[PDB]
Amino acid sequence: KVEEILEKALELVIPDEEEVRKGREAEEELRRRLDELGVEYVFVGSYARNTWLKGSLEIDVFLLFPEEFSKEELRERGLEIGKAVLDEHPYVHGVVKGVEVDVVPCYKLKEPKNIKSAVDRTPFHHKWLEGRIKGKENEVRLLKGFLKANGIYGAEYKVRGFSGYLCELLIVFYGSFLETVKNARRWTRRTVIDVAKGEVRKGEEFFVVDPVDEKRNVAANLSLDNLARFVHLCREFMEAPSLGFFKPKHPLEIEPERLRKIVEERGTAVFAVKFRKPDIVDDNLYPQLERASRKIFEFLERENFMPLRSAFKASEEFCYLLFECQIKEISRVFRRMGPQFEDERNVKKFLSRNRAFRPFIENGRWWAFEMRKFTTPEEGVRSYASTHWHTLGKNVGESIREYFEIISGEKLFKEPVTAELCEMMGVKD
Ligand SMILES: [Ca+2]
Ligand SMILES: [Ca+2]
Ligand SMILES: [Ca+2]
Ligand SMILES: [Mg+2]
């Protein structure tokens, strides 16, 4: 059955003529414009190697240069060859014949001499792959489609999954999609896949050695949990192959009343911190949302609200930090630790404070009943976000400093976070 399933999967991952047409049209046209300017360039994307996933057409053209500052010479070229345009790091993005195109500067290099490397490597990545991926393009597509349908294709921080480069290296290492999944069933968090040496060994962390640069982990951005999810999916697929593994899962359709019912049944405190989304790119925002979520989670743990799990969502205008806690309310009174009975001066100090109830000795130490300044996790977070917003990421914290609100109940359910809430609580269809 497996072999038959992969055949049907091909219809979902391979681009259809009409988009493959747009690519061709745009490529010829882009070459014409580049040639006329006598520009030295090379197509290095997934498009150039016909390994791009259906519906994901885009062109990556790198411009080869020797000098130091040409950040502007590229500004020109890109701006001149692109029908429409927008924006060391800086590059030109636009469209040509209706196709997305990235125009990046870099040094035409006499091989491995990557200057303040990053963009200078890409051409080598393409060179190494070009002659080794031929004939296995669709294998790469099945891999990408499999990953995408399961939300783990993409190395951007929003996804923390598998980069396209990583997918091609895997296909080259194992030979095909099927073989990649069969072997991935045995990957561990210490697995080192050294492509250039054709070997697998144990290491400190999951590491896929870049054949172009040994010290670089091509899977640097693949999170531990998405590696885990992939290994599991691979095991599940081989156990019972289904075309469904290549199909995106469908958004759980649930009314607010049913969400309220689930929450009331779990008996937890479910709430969110809502604030304006700061004007920064995803690769900057997402790590800040993860940090903010973690700090508040840690605050909730420390304050004994027993948080279960957290999650976040970035909409067009707002961001949401979601939490579920096992404690909806904690007592006003708490135990404040005092000094050992021996320390006379500190004991007098500890006892000099006015309190509603008398302190006491326990296990040779003084203790006092004191009052919390909040009794619900929502009140705890209102306090934390009001004075400790600086710990929530530079831009996320600054937005929260200006404005935030804690929402729960039907109000919360109305926000565009239902999918994140369901996922967080493990709600099923
Ligand atoms: Ca995500
Ligand atoms: Ca995810
Ligand atoms: Ca209260
Ligand atoms: Mg691109």
UniProtKB/Swiss-Prot annotation:
Mg(2+) binds at E58, D60, D102. Signal peptide: none annotated. GO terms for biological process: RNA repair; tRNA 3'-terminal CCA addition; tRNA surveillance. This is CCA-adding enzyme. ATP binds at S46, R49, H125, K144, Y153. Belongs to the tRNA nucleotidyltransferase/poly(A) polymerase family. Archaeal CCA-adding enzyme subfamily. GO terms for molecular function: ATP binding; CCA tRNA nucleotidyltransferase activity; CCACCA tRNA nucleotidyltransferase activity; magnesium ion binding; tRNA binding. CTP binds at S46, R49, H125, K144, Y153. Catalyzes the addition and repair of the essential 3'-terminal CCA sequence in tRNAs without using a nucleic acid template. Adds these three nucleotides in the order of C, C, and A to the tRNA nucleotide-73, using CTP and ATP as substrates and producing inorganic pyrophosphate. tRNA 3'-terminal CCA addition is required both for tRNA processing and repair. Also involved in tRNA surveillance by mediating tandem CCA addition to generate a CCACCA at the 3' terminus of unstable tRNAs. While stable tRNAs receive only 3'-terminal CCA, unstable tRNAs are marked with CCACCA and rapidly degraded. It holds the Pfam family CAA_C. The gene is cca.
